[PDB]
Each structure stands twice: as C-alpha cells, then as structure tokens.
Design a protein around this ligand. Structure first.
Ligand code: M6B
Ligand code: M6B
Ligand code: PO3
Ligand code: NA
Length: 498
C-alpha cells in the first residue's frame, strides 16, 4: 500500500536557464510548462539538475548562471506542487560531466568530503541552497567516489541528513520531510568502489537510485542491451569485480554471492544491493533510461545484438558524420550515439529502415537497421511492464529515470510507469517474466527462508548436510563435521528459519 517513488530528472543547461523561455523550442526545447498537471501527478520527485561543487568546496550553481533566471525556473517547478501534494522538487549535485574521475570539478568533490571541517562547510551549503531556492531535498550524483573518498562521502551524507532533519523540524515539514538521495552505480565495476560500505552509504538516504542503464555503450567490445532486466546466455558476460571487494568474507561466501562471469543486468545490480545486510529493499530504486544508445558498423545475424561495431567512443564526437538515420536531435546535438525515446519513436515511424525487435530473455526492445548496420538499445512501455512487475515483486522503493525531456510529447513512458504501479484496472498477475538468467547470488542480506532438521550434538555430518540451529539453516562445507554450526569455519549459513 505504500506508493512507489517515480523520480524523474529535469535537466536544463546554463545557457538555456540564462535565456529561459516557454515559447521557443529552438532556445529551450523542454521548458517547465511541458510538465503538465497530469505529468506532475504521475511523479513523486523531480530531480532538478545539475548543480556543482566549486573550488570553495561548497554546493553552487554554475558561476555563469543568471541567478534571477535560475530562481524563476526553479519557482516554476515548485509551483507544480499545487497539483500534487506528494511531489518533491529535489536538486541534484554532480552528474558525469562535473564529477567523473577526469571531470572538470572532480577535485572539489574529493576535497569537499575529505575532512570534518570541509564536510561541515559543504553540508551547510547544500541545505542553504535547498532553502534559498525552495527545493525539497538533495540528491548527490558523484560518479563515483572511490577508495579513501568513501569514508569521507559517508560522513558527508550523515551530516547532510542531520541538517535536513533540523530543517524539517524548523519548517514543520513532517508531512513531506526534506529528503536525501544519491544516484548509485548500477553495474558492478563502479559499484565495487564503495560496495563494502554499502549499508553505511544507504543508511542516511531515503532512496539510492540505481543507475541501471548505460550498461552498454561504445566503450564495450560488442553491442549489448544497456538495461537488460535479465540475462541472455548468447550475450556477453563480465568479471564480477565485487568478489575482489574488501569484505573479509571466505572463499565459499564470496563464491556464493558473486558468480563470475556474470550477466550485466538490472536484476544483477538490484540483487547485489539486496545481498548486503542493512540495505532495505524499500530504499532501492530502479533507474531506467528514457534514451537509446546507438551503435554503427554492426553485423547481421542476430539483429545487431552482440556484434563487433565501429562506434567512436571519444568525447566530443570526432567528426560530422551523423549516421543515426532519421535522428534530427543528433544533428542538433552533433552526436549520433544517443537518442531520446521521443526521437526513437519518430525514427521508427518514418521510412528510415529500422525494425523494432524484442529480446524475450532481457525483456527489452532494440532497433536494427539491416541496411546500414545499426543497433539501438533502449526501453519502452513494454519493457517497463516487466521492470514494474520486478519492482513490485522485489519490494523496491520505486523507479527513477533519466530524463523527463526525453519522454515523448504526450509523456507516454511516465504514464506507463504510473499506470503499472497505480492503475486499479491494470493487471500484471499473468505477465510472464521469462527464462532469462537471474543473478543467483546470496549474501547475508538476502538469505532464503529454509527448513532443515535440527542440529544434534554428536552426529557426524557429511559434506553438503543441512541442519537448523539458532535461527538459521547451515550447510557443512566438507565432512565429517560434529561442531555446533557457527562455532568454526566448517559450516556455511545458507538460510533463515521462519
Ligand atoms: C547524467 C548525465 C550525463 O551528462 C550529460 C552528458 C554528459 C551526456 O551524457 C549522456 O547523456 N549520457 C547518458 C546518460 C548517462 N547518465 C549518467 N551518467 N548519470 C545519470 O544518469 N545520472 C542521474 C552526453 C551525451 C552529452 O550530451 O555531452 C554533451 C555533448 C553532446 C556535453 C558534454 O557537451 C553536455 O552538453 C549538455 C547537453 C549541455 O549537457 C552538459 C554537457 C556540457 C551536461 C553538464 C551533461 C549532460 C547532462 O548533458
Ligand atoms: C574501450 C575502452 C577502455 O577505456 C576505458 C573505459 C572506456 C572502460 O572500457 C572498458 O574497460 N571496456 C570493456 C571492459 C569492461 N567493461 C565494463 N567495465 N563495462 C561496464 O562497466 N559497463 C557499464 C569502461 C569500463 C568505462 O569505464 O567507460 C566509462 C563510462 C562507463 C568512460 C568511457 O566514461 C570512462 O570513464 C573513466 C572511468 C573516467 O575513464 C575514462 C572514460 C571517460 C577513460 C578515458 C577510459 C578508460 C581507460 O577508463
Ligand atoms: O541524421 P538524419 O538522417 O536526420
Ligand atoms: Na522503413
């Protein structure tokens, strides 16, 4: 009965703020007024993006921002709360461009969290910005802290949380308390930077919004779905970096939690979070893309999937060949590698030579252009059925998406998500989740309920034997064991009673 979060990013670049208008699409293509009252009601959160951390190690607007015009844009968002008393307008600090390891502001992230005094100054700036502009909470999208930064980052989230709670009391906002989220890694390689401390990262948050998209891109050897729900045995597999994290676990505990190689999927990332003790399913939000990733130079045979390709990975895009046939936004943005769902529907509708195909393992669509050798991986209202059902079945907090400006004009992706969670007449009880590969790791946070005979002192247990003892089901790792389960290294806790 607790409503699923539906968290949509609203991104607007500094030049568009500084020239804001709602009546000229060539200047601002996605003004706040495209978020109509019906869209407002279907959202729980809008994440306004992006703010940054400056060299004074405070949360700050891009210094080229016209402040009066910024306030105006933010005021138009917050006015939407008139249509939906559950709605929050968050603001987001970071993003890939500012905060990636080679990003323009990267050192400011590292330095802002590094010491107690820096964290106090930074935390205060976040809450000051939030109050000054009328936002409802803070989202941190640092992609990604690593190493010694992680203890600092945790401390900074803890301090923000305390300051938000103070502000909730001050404003009497107990009915809509100020919130703290992060955009979390959605793939094991980046997740491995802070994985061992995941319960400490999540504790101060209302949600961790997993970036379970961009799981494929031009940096990969072969094409792949960027947001596959489940795995396809014909697709690529990857090393499970989490088995090397500083967890202190045994070989058997590692091996049971972290199969390798593994399929890089939404389900993988969600299960990886659930495995960890102290990470509640209700805080885990599944991110979904409202854009496709395009590849060129692909071979025939399986619809462009799992092919070698010739897509440049350099930034900026290195030439003026805008080879994504039918994508006008790509010409405008000078980059054929990403296209909004909005644009993709038009490409598919026009006579551009794409077929829309469906992978019934991954439960995702893809475009194939057989003549030119193009492949596009994206999500639609159909893949959203399976993802919504998964969110309900796994008792997740909800869905996040990047970004609102990429939905079609009628807002059909957002409407679909809202329907699958909230429509009285939508029924997915019979929706078949398929036989794609499930991530089968088990860790301390997601032990299955099991039964077994009670342990008996004196009995010699062979390898593989299962007993119940003190709340759990235990399995011997070798034989013959007579020790009490948990008293030495021979027993593996495999299950929980009752
Ligand atoms: C989030 C994110 C990715 O960041 C994209 C920005 C880095 C764009 O990256 C993507 O959209 N990638 C797909 C989404 C990946 N998502 C994330 N990593 N993180 C995320 O979703 N966080 C919630 C790329 C494709 C892009 O547009 O770069 C532009 C050239 C085409 C930039 C780099 O010039 C870009 O131009 C504009 C469009 C004005 O955006 C600027 C930045 C200056 C911001 C700062 C960067 C973003 C928001 O467009
Ligand atoms: C192709 C290639 C190899 O290049 C990798 C760099 C391109 C890496 O390429 C590979 O290692 N390729 C395949 C092997 C492993 N595959 C994955 N790790 N897949 C995965 O994480 N999927 C989400 C991938 C994993 C990567 O990290 O890409 C990043 C976005 C996800 C980049 C492209 O944004 C990357 O981010 C950082 C981490 C800041 O590194 C940057 C560059 C900006 C350098 C310039 C690129 C390299 C050196 O990290
Ligand atoms: O790049 P185009 O065929 O709009
Ligand atoms: Na056609």
């Amino acid at each position: 009965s607790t409503r699923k979060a539906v968290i949509g990013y609203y991104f607007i670049p500094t030049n568009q703020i500084n020239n804001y208008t709602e009546t000229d699409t060539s200047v601002v293509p996605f003004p706040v007024s495209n978020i109509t009252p019906a869209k407002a009601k279907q959202l729980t959160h809008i994440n306004f993006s992006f703010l940054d951390i400056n060299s004074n190690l405070e949360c700050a607007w891009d210094p080229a921002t016209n402040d009066a015009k910024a306030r105006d844009v933010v005021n138009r968002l917050t006015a939407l709360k008139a249509h939906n008393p559950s709605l929050r307008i968050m603001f987001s600090i970071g993003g890939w461009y500012y905060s990636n390891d080679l990003g323009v502001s990267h050192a400011n992230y590292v330095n802002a969290v590094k010491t107690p005094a820096a964290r106090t100054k930074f935390a205060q700036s976040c809450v000051r910005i939030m109050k000054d502009y009328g936002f409802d909470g803070v989202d941190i999208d640092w992609e990604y802290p690593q190493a010694a930064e992680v203890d600092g980052f945790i401390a900074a989230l803890q301090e923000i949380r305390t300051l938000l709670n103070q502000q909730t009391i001050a404003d009497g906002r107990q009915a809509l308390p100020y919130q703290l989220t992060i955009a979390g890694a959605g793939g094991a390689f980046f997740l491995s930077r802070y994985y061992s401390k995941l319960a400490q990262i999540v504790a101060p948050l209302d949600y961790i919004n997993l970036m379970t998209y961009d799981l494929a891109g031009p940096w990969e050897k072969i094409t792949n779905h960027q947001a596959a729900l489940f795995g396809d045995a014909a697709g690529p597999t990857f090393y499970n970096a989490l088995r090397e994290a500083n967890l202190g676990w045994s070989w058997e505990e590692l091996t049971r939690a972290f199969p390798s190689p593994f399929s890089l999927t939404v389900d993988a990332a969600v299960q990886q979070h659930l495995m960890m003790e102290g990470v509640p399913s209700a805080k885990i939000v599944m991110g979904v893309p409202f854009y496709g990733r395009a590849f060129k130079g692909v071979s025939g045979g399986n619809g462009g999937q799992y092919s070698s390709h010739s897509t440049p990975g350099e930034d900026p895009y290195p030439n003026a060949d805008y080879w994504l046939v039918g994508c006008d936004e790509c010409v405008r943005d000078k980059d054929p590698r990403i296209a909004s769902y909005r644009q993709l529907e038009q490409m598919l509708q026009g006579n551009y030579g794409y077929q829309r195909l469906w992978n019934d393992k991954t439960k995702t669509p893809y475009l194939y252009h057989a003549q030119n050798g193009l492949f596009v991986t994206y999500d639609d209202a159909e893949s959203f059925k399976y993802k919504a059902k998964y969110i309900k079945q796994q008792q997740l907090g909800g869905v996040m998406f990047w970004h609102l400006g990429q939905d079609n004009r009628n807002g059909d992706l957002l409407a679909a998500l809202d329907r699958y969670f909230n429509a009285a007449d939508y029924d997915d009880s019979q929706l078949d989740m398929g036989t794609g590969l499930r991530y089968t790791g088990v860790g301390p946070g997601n032990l299955p309920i099991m039964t077994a005979p009670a342990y008996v002192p004196g009995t010699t247990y062979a390898q593989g034997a299962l007993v119940s003892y003190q709340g759990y089901v235990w399995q011997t790792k070798w034989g013959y064991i007579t020790s009490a389960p948990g008293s030495d290294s021979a027993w593996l806790k495999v299950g929980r009673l009752a």
